[PDB]
Amino acid sequence: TWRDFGRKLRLLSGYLWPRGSPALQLVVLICLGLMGLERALNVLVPIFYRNIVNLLTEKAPWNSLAWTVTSYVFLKFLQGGGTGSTGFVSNLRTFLWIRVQQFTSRRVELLIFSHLHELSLRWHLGRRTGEVLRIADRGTSSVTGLLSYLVFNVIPTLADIIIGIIYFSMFFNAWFGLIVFLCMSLYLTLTIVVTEWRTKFRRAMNTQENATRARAVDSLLNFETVKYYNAESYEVERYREAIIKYQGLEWKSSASLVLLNQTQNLVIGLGLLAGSLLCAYFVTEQKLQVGDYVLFGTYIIQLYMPLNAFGTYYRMIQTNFIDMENMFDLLKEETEVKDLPGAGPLRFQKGRIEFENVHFSYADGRETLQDVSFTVMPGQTLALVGPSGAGKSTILRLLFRFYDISSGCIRIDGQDISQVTQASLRSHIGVVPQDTVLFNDTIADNIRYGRVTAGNDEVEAAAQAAGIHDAIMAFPEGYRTQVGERGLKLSGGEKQRVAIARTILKAPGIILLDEATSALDTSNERAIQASLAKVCANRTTIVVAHRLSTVVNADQILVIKDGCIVERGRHEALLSRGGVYADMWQLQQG
Amino acid sequence: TWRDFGRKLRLLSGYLWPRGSPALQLVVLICLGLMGLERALNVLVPIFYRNIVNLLTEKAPWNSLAWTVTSYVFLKFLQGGGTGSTGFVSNLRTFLWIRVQQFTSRRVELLIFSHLHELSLRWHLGRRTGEVLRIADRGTSSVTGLLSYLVFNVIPTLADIIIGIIYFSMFFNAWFGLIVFLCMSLYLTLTIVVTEWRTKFRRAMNTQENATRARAVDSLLNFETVKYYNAESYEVERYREAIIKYQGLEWKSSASLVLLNQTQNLVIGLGLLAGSLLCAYFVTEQKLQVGDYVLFGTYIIQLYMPLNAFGTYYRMIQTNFIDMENMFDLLKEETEVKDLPGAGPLRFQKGRIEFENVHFSYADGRETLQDVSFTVMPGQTLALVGPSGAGKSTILRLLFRFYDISSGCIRIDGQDISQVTQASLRSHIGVVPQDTVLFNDTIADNIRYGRVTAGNDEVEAAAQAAGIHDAIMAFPEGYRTQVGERGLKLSGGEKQRVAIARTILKAPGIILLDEATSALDTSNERAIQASLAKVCANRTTIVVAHRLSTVVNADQILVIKDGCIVERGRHEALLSRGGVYADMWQLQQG
Ligand SMILES: CCCCCCCCCCCCCCCCCC(=O)O[C@@H](COC(=O)CCCCCCCCCCCCCCC)COP(=O)(O)OCCN
Ligand SMILES: CCCCCCCCCCCCCCCCCC(=O)O[C@@H](COC(=O)CCCCCCCCCCCCCCC)COP(=O)(O)OCCN
Ligand SMILES: [Mg+2]
Ligand SMILES: [Mg+2]
């Protein structure tokens, strides 16, 4: 509708006045003043011109005429090029604003890069990288740009037309003071009537646009596959057939503009005809002197120039508006798993975890995990075994509180999860992820990410827990070797080794291992678990392992089939029962 | 230096003539013409003004005066504001160019999205996503936004000054002429001197800029890690401390400009003073007439204003230059592993492979692979076993020819691979990668990527071989579900099952498996390898497996220690030897 526009402009205005620093809160006044003086000069230059022509007509000494001429030339210097150009009053402000603009830009940026890191997991696993980056880079340049064309080229221009009608009405004749008024009115009423009839087009451009780029920016973030299967053509072609349909529409909306920018010309044109013709009539009938026909020949032009100038800008102002809209959209989304106000930090003494009839659904259609309850005594290791797709990892994801349960209760150390602050909750737990990703930085700094204070001593010693010390030293330059983006450059298993080294360095109260021996050879896992046995002496540990050679000494064993527990107990007590665990053990060992 | 500018401009100008379609090769002439007419009207308006002032001075009938004024209110309509704005002999050109700025904004896009996909691996595993995207999205607007300010606002302006000096010399006094000439000369000699002094600054801005964004577009790609280990603040801060340095070094290059834009004002100023004083003097000494003063008071103002306007654009015309420079660099590089001239398709008959004393290195510091040779008969399944980091995957990488060798020879089916075209070579081999990635699309289209002409019936039949048909149908919406981005949405092992189904659908001449049973439970591996034994009836296979339970029936077994072959033979022939393979097998079996 035509009201939302208003709401939007209001918001953009809020970012002008700096809020916090007094000094700056002054520059924003002086600047305004210079704006004031220039408006006056605009109505004092034309007048002086009349004088230097009047005197010349009647004749006078070379002396008197001289001083007068100098005056005119001076004032032109202080205001050259009308509104929207250079000069000496104007450009003296563009040198006292550079500072304020750098206080608004920063603030906006460090706000669209904080929110993106507070949103929840569900949203993140569905975004389209391409877009979430385009929006965040062009966005911070929209707000600054517009706030500088709506306070320095629009509002000023408008004020001038008015000052004009006051004059040309109480200092010249009168009728002339009407010809100007009507012109403007029509100019406006021919803009609105047209701007609307165009919006039917601009709207159906943005949508197609954001979908004529996606596919592509997703065939460059997955290079390997587009090579193995030797495509590399199927792709280039598909693009061509999308850069065509988009173009077919922009023509429509890049021609409407030429129409709007031509109809306006006429309205202006007619105005000049009326005025010029009438003025001459009067001077013939001895009512206004010739001199005067010069004033109404300079003031006018210098008052209609601005309108026409905006003609070469309409194109951009549109684009900038669109981008602002998008950014603001994002800053209105809401986090899903929030925190309860008035919450206290967790009290950690032993580390006991208990589940109480938890039911969970992903897409509200089926229950992936349902009716699970277990208890772990402090200082004990629990293991989970089952077929693929049974829901093993969902329990670990839910313990860390990345999602919210629907029913039941989860309690640790006698305290429920839902009322303690997450920030204090996550400081007691460290987990090795299923897949390893490393920053595009050096291996030493990748290892140090567990805690940003330790010196090379601990990094070095902790490097011995995973058995990577004897391997890194053989590398050229030792621990300052590069890793590459996402860690693809390094190798296949030492990514897992450095991940487990990070976790060991962190040394949390409770340790959880999703997969640890996925990529290691059969002669390296043993040593790793032997080293880990000395570290897990007094810490609760949950381990998941498809291979059953690791949980033979597990303190407790659980079997998950389709999210419902099927049996439990130790190793030998499960073997004697002759159940599914015994069947799988026999199948694996013989 | 000051000559590179030359080569640069030459290129940006090699794009203003559609090279192909004829029709278009015409619009580019009529456009040029309209330019001509306008550059004339500019000297036929000031003149008419004088006439309507002379007549008024001496008196005349309302009739005659009337038919004169009309003229000076028509020519104004056609000319418009000036040399950089709207009108009616200008707009009519910006409506016949839209169709030529869309044949130069395509050709230059489907050329920076092709080259990025023919570069080789080394480069790719070392880029910085953040940047490569940017360079390729802002880049296609520079070369289409400068060609429009170097053939419609510069060259035109220059022509006008000259026409002015010709006149004002052979039609008016001829002494004034000198004034104009000198003024312009000085204007230029100041621009050149100042521009260079400034360059020292602009150069040291770009560099810091591209590095104040890296550690920021790389903490939004690897989201998980920035949560597990908490953080989420350590980051926001680092950003702030880098948005400060950049700023401090721009208030330098955003103030130099204000200086350059004030000096120029003075030079222009002086010119007007000289002229006016002189002209007035002559009119006193009876040489010119009042009428004449009016001409030298309108022509000048409309011959200097066009220049000042450029004062408010300098900012952008810099940024655009910088971006063009970068794009060119990318389009100026070179592929690493090219193809020998000529050459022909590979003559495949059976499927034999041979290695002949291959020595190769990665970074010229260490020898990753050295002294490797083997051979496979047409129909078996060689296997490789060894410790981690021994170089198992490098052999597979070197077969596909992603990198290149230093010595030795590689022969397939009797033909060396170094001369045969890679396009024909890579149509006979299909490999499941070590890490599985999926397109952000539906599962059916993702699994159809093996061959684009496949049908639903054969896709459904082939999905049964991997054992996933009985699993997908239980999902809601069946085969039209989403997999998210990169495939993190699906599961932990179903990605691997989908990848192996893709490979089976492709059905190449030679099959290679890096790791297939990494994420599968022990109850599903058997059925899978039994199913895979049926399709390898007449296809050579190479299999890598850390677990030795799937290699017991291998036709040939190799042991790779540190890239040097230690022993070879079958399974029982190696068990009796009592070597390292026997030790590993015992240790695994317990
Ligand atoms: C905070 C105080 C502000 C005081 C002044 C406010 C009013 C300023 C004058 C506005 C006159 C034009 C109003 C009608 C157009 C409004 C929309 C617009 O300007 O840009 C739109 C996009 O339109 C364009 O593509 C062209 C953009 C420029 C059009 C207006 C040009 C400037 C104003 C011209 C008249 C004012 C006098 C001359 C200014 C030289 C943005 O999207 P939208 O509002 O159309 O979307 C929702 C409604 N459909
Ligand atoms: C193909 C035929 C072209 C004919 C005309 C060619 C010459 C046109 C007039 C050029 C006059 C200015 C020459 C000196 C500046 C050249 C550089 C430039 O314009 O922009 C530079 C960046 O400078 C700026 O930031 C300001 C950009 C605008 C400066 C020139 C403004 C337009 C020309 C002004 C004089 C012409 C008459 C008035 C123009 C309306 C781009 O980088 P760089 O060349 O400095 O880097 C290597 C050399 N250091
Ligand atoms: Mg999992
Ligand atoms: Mg490997």
Author numbering:
A (entry chain B), B (entry chain A): 238 to 827
Copy out sentences from the published article reporting this entry, exactly as the authors wrote them.
Notably, in the post-occluded state, we observed strong electron density within a hydrophobic groove formed by the elbow helix, TM 9, and TM 11 of each monomer. The density shape corresponds to a phospholipid molecule with two fatty acyl chains. Therefore, we constructed an atomic model of the POPE (or 16:0-18:1 PE) molecule in the head-down orientation as a representative phospholipid model. Our analysis revealed that POPE interacts with highly conserved residues across species. Furthermore, given the presence of a similar lipid density in the pre-occluded state, it is evident that a phospholipid bound to the TMD groove acts as a ‘wedge’ to stabilize the occlusion state of the transporter. Collectively, our findings suggest that direct protein-lipid interactions contribute to the increase in the relative stability of the inward-facing or occluded states. Structural analysis suggests that the lipid inserted within the TMD groove may compensate for the W546A mutation by acting as a molecular wedge to resist conformational transitions to the outward-facing form. In the lipid environment, however, the transporter predominantly adopted the post-occluded state irrespective of the presence of the W546A mutation. Formation of the post-occluded state after substrate release reorients the TMDs closer together at the two-fold dimer axis such that the central cavity is no longer present (lower left).
